Design a protein around this ligand. Structure first.
Ligand SMILES: [Mg+2]
Ligand SMILES: [Mg+2]
Lengths: 92, 98, 25, 92, 151, 101
């Protein structure tokens, strides 16, 4: 009945996936840029490419180890550059 | 002389689009600004081409007549300027600004 | 404070004009 | 608590491509505004008179204005100068 | 009590693979007398309005515009195919209700379709588009992909 | 123009002390650089001492540590201890299996 007619709006958007954007009728190219940001922050393009071909578990583990090391190495590098800039500012 | 400088300042285009062979892909048509010496060259060549369509055997006479008509408002080179500025307005987004 | 607020005025104006051009894109 | 990441000893401390702020050319922005002014109010419209006057002055002698178009980064000079002092390496 | 099929919105679906681009335009049809049927529970009514039937109207690929073999998966093939779709939506009087765009994968035609819809080619359709979404299908484990190619 | 973007002007709170440097652009840039979600701890249940595994039937709290698509956030982003990250991830996976998240 109408009870099943007036409660479909929330119901429709209650089962969201999180990969949708409400387009800004003024700047429609800014909404596509927002959608692209979601894809990159959920690694959708990377995951899709990584699922095209099978990789042996040992190779997967090697790649995961190297990637983590490079991520951590970059964090250590930036920490040292910040110290350099701070030291330079104070005249060291 | 004041008439000549006014005519050159009104006929010369402020900007002109140029094709830059940047990248293996198609070149980019980016509007470029023009300096006063470059602006005068473009306007003078238009004046000379217009002058050489007149009947006099003497270039000085044809040039004099052409300059007089331009100082009085009538010139066919104002169309050229409008067409160079239209192209640049179209490619306004292609500018780099850095 | 005036010395600082004068430099800040220039930069604000400059950066409120680059935004206008960059946003026009 | 914020995890500090400490690098191993390194042969160098260097930024591959140091970022630099390239200020936008004043004549190019003047041209970008005039072109926009003509796009809305029309070409040669009396509303863009000031833009035309300013553009002519900016480009009168040099089409890109008289600017100090030179800027270099010094991070690599300081990073190499201070690395041995700040890396926290143990004594010999 | 009477079939009252009506269009509620349109779905513009784009599947952008490595070798082709498929663009489907559909209509979300709603029988506005479904709730007037007898022996209909609150669950069946809510379940019918949560997944409304869809009817395909326009189906296009890059080979319908004359692009053949390797050219089908290129940027230019997708841009022109997107234009032909935006035109066929106006030539069929299907630009009255709101359109929802669903993009599926990340081939070279995904950025061509977006450019053709935020540009002159899609200045009529873009005004009706209300929601954009991504429907890329990923697997949580699932079937074994083919072996890596040694090239 | 009588208007400036908020990103180009600093609003000094009321009751606070300031220096002339607080009106400069350096202050604006310095505030952006050192802008961290440090106030989360006081608003972060999982950084308070509660056991995240007691929230497995409360999807609303758990939904604060997943992305828009439901992907559990890395410890680098949540800032939790190893134990709480381990317990929180278990809670979310259990919540997903029960049919609540
Ligand atoms: Mg191909
Ligand atoms: Mg096989």
């Amino acid at each position: 009945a109408e009870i099943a007619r007036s409660s479909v709006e929330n119901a429709q958007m209650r089962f969201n996936s999180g990969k949708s954007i409400i387009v800004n009728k003024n700047n429609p190219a800014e909404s596509f840029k927002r959608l692209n940001r979601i894809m990159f922050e959920n690694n959708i393009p990377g995951d899709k490419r990584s699922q095209r071909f099978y990789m042996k578990p040992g190779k997967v583990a090697e790649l995961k180890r190297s990637q983590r090391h490079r991520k951590e190495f970059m964090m250590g590098f930036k920490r040292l550059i910040e110290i350099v800039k701070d030291a330079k500012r104070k005249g060291y | 002389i004041q008439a000549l400088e006014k005519s050159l300042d009104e006929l010369a285009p402020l900007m002109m689009t140029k094709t830059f062979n940047t990248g293996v892909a198609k070149a980019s048509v980016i509007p470029v600004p023009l300096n006063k010496r470059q602006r005068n060259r473009i306007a003078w060549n238009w004046i000379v081409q217009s002058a050489n369509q007149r009947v006099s055997s003497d270039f000085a006479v044809r040039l004099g007549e052409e300059l007089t008509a331009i100082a009085k408002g009538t010139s066919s080179a104002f169309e050229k300027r409008d067409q160079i500025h239209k192209t640049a307005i179209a490619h306004r987004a292609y500018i780099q600004l850095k | 404070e005036q010395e600082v607020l004068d430099v800040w005025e220039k930069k604000v104006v400059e950066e409120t004009e680059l935004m206008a051009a960059r946003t026009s894109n | 608590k914020p995890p500090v990441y400490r690098l191993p000893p390194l042969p160098r401390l260097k930024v591959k491509k140091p970022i630099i702020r390239q200020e936008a050319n004043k004549c190019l922005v003047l041209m970008s505004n005039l072109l926009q002014c003509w796009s809305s109010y029309g070409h040669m419209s009396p509303k863009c008179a000031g833009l035309v006057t300013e553009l002519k002055s900016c480009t009168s002698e040099s089409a890109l204005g008289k600017r100090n178009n030179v800027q270099k980064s010094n991070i690599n000079y300081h990073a190499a100068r201070l690395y041995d002092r700040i890396n926290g390496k143990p004594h010999d | 009590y009477k079939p009252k099929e009506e269009v509620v919105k349109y779905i513009l679906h784009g599947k952008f693979t490595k070798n082709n681009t498929h663009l489907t335009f559909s209509s979300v049809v709603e029988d506005k007398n479904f709730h007037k049927n007898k022996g209909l529970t609150y669950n069946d009514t809510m379940l019918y309005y949560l997944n409304l039937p869809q009817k395909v109207k326009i189906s296009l690929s890059t080979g319908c515009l004359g692009f053949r073999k390797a050219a089908r998966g290129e940027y230019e093939a997708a841009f022109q195919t997107s234009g032909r779709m935006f035109e066929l939506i106006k030539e069929k009087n299907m630009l009255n209700k709101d359109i929802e765009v669903v993009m599926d994968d990340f081939g070279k035609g995904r950025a061509a379709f977006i450019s053709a819809l935020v540009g002159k080619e899609g200045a009529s359709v873009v005004k009706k588009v209300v929601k954009i979404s991504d429907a890329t299908k990923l697997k949580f484990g699932g079937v074994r992909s083919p072996k890596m190619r040694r090239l | 123009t009588k208007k400036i973007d908020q990103s180009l002007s600093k609003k000094l709170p009321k009751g606070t002390i300031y220096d002339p440097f607080d009106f400069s652009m350096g202050r604006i840039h310095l505030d952006r650089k050192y802008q961290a979600n440090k106030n989360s701890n006081r608003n972060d249940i999982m950084k308070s001492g509660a056991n995240p595994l007691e929230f497995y039937a409360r999807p609303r709290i758990l939904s604060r540590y997943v992305t828009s698509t439901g992907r559990i956030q890395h410890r680098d982003i949540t800032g939790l201890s190893a134990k709480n990250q381990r317990r929180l991830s278990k809670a979310i996976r259990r919540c997903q299996a029960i049919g609540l998240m």
